[PDB]
Amino acid sequence: LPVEYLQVPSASMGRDIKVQFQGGGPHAVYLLDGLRAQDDYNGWDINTPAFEEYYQSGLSVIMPVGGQSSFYTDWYQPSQSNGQNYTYKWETFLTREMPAWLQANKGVSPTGNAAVGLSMSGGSALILAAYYPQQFPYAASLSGFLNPSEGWWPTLIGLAMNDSGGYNANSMWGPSSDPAWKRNDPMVQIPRLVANNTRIWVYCGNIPAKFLEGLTLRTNQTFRDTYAADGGRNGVFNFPPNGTQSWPYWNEQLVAMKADIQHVLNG
Numbered sequence: 254l255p256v257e258y259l260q261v262p263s264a265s266m267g268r269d270i271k272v273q274f275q276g277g278g279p280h281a282v283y284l285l286d287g288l289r290a291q292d293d294y295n296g297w298d299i300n301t302p303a304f305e306e307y308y309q310s311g312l313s314v315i316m317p318v319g320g321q322s323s324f325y326t327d328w329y330q331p332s333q334s335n336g337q338n339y340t341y342k343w344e345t346f347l348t349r350e351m352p353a354w355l356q357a358n359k360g361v362s363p364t365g366n367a368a369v370g371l372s373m374s375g376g377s378a379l380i381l382a383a384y385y386p387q388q389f390p391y392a393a394s395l396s397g398f399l400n401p402s403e404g405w406w407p408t409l410i411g412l413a414m415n416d417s418g419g420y421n422a423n424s425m426w427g428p429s430s431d432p433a434w435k436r437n438d439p440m441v442q443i444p445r446l447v448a449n450n451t452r453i454w455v456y457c458g459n460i461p462a463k464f465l466e467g468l469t470l471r472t473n474q475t476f477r478d479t480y481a482a483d484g485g486r487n488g489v490f491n492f493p494p495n496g497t498q499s500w501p502y503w504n505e506q507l508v509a510m511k512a513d514i515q516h517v518l519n520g
Contacts, residue, residue, distance in 0.1 A: 272315060282315065295318050372498070386449035452517045459494070
């Protein structure tokens with residue numbers, strides 16, 4: 254497999270970002286990592302046969318490396334906690350710096366791509382499509398936080414970020430009253446997804462665990478209902494009863510959506 258590891262400078266973060274890359278077409282699937290993203294390899298490559306599965310698909314595969322608890326967003330400030338000495342600017346990196354580099358050096362198109370995220374980055378993928386539709390006509394959220402600004406979620410997200418490397422949600426989007434929470438909330442941005450005619454693929458499977466499961470189920474159902482209510486007509490919603498929040502099932506969804514991505518991005 255022709256897999257490469259690239260060092261892509263980020264001016265906005267003042268450091269080089271490692272990117273795992275497999276070519277195979279001008280359009281690409283951006284495979285975003287989960288909450289506990291490591292600095293050596295992307296979780297998709299650690300845990301799944303994603304590169305092999307998309308080999309000769311007619312699509313390039315891009316796996317950025319790093320950004321633990323970042324939500325692939327532009328933060329307000331360095332993390333209030335764990336000694337981070339720069340500000341995460343992952344939205345700038347994914348929408349400007351990285352595609353600029355891949356276009357200039359390899360001819361990867363900056364437009365007409367897919368964003369696929371899981372856990373932490375499921376919502377990120379939808380937000381990228383909401384605000385950058387020419388770049389991401391396709392977005393998939395696998396077990397993402399679909400309503401991060403609502404109810405229990407700002408607290409639960411803050412707790413998860415702190416548990417995953419000691420990152421501080423206040424440094425990211427401010428207190429939960431800050432406009433950044435709603436800005437980055439896929440539920441709140443459903444009208445953009447509808448206006449953009451984004452092709453969305455939304456998966457989810459199924460404090461005490463049962464309480465968390467109830468919150469998750471209700472939020473996911475609300476997202477689906479709201480998408481339809483708001484005139485959404487370009488979505489796939491996969492809620493299989495046996496679905497889990499795990500790399501094996503996230504891989505199953507990545508494989509299942511391959512034909513979908515091929516038809517949307519490559520006709």
